[PDB]
């Protein structure tokens, strides 16, 4: 539940598919799977999360956008 682990695990998944410098639906999906499968139960579907996370329009859910989830994962 550490922060350093978030980066590590994150990259561990971001490196899974495509460049680890960018997250994806399938990529994040996995994370959201193990990382927080409960967040998947939310009313925010994968696609919803994907589009939700990306509020810039790059397609990459970099850790930056991820920090946005940490908020929901906090509440
Ligand atoms: La982005």
């Amino acid at each position: 539940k550490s922060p350093e682990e978030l980066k590590g695990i994150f990259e561990k998944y971001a490196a899974k598919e495509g460049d680890p410098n960018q997250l994806s639906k399938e990529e994040l999906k996995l994370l959201l799977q193990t990382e927080f499968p409960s967040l998947l139960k939310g009313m925010s579907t994968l696609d919803e999360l994907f589009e939700e996370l990306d509020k810039n329009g790059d397609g990459e859910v970099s850790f930056e956008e991820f920090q946005v989830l940490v908020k929901k994962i906090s509440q």
Side-chain angles (χ1 to χ4, degrees), residues 17 19 22-32 39-40 42-69:
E17 282 229 286
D19 211 284
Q22 44 202 11
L23 284 257
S24 299
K25 196 211 230 179
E26 242 232 284
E27 264 212 322
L28 210 31
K29 180 151 131 174
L30 302 198
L31 203 125
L32 305 169
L39 243 276
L40 293 164
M43 299 156 173
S44 296
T45 64
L46 218 324
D47 240 288
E48 250 209 72
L49 226 124
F50 184 85
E51 235 200 286
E52 182 173 25
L53 299 149
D54 181 61
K55 205 211 158 137
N56 359 61
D58 336 63
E60 315 307 72
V61 167
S62 17
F63 198 45
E64 39 126 342
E65 298 142 292
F66 191 99
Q67 309 222 323
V68 188
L69 213 60

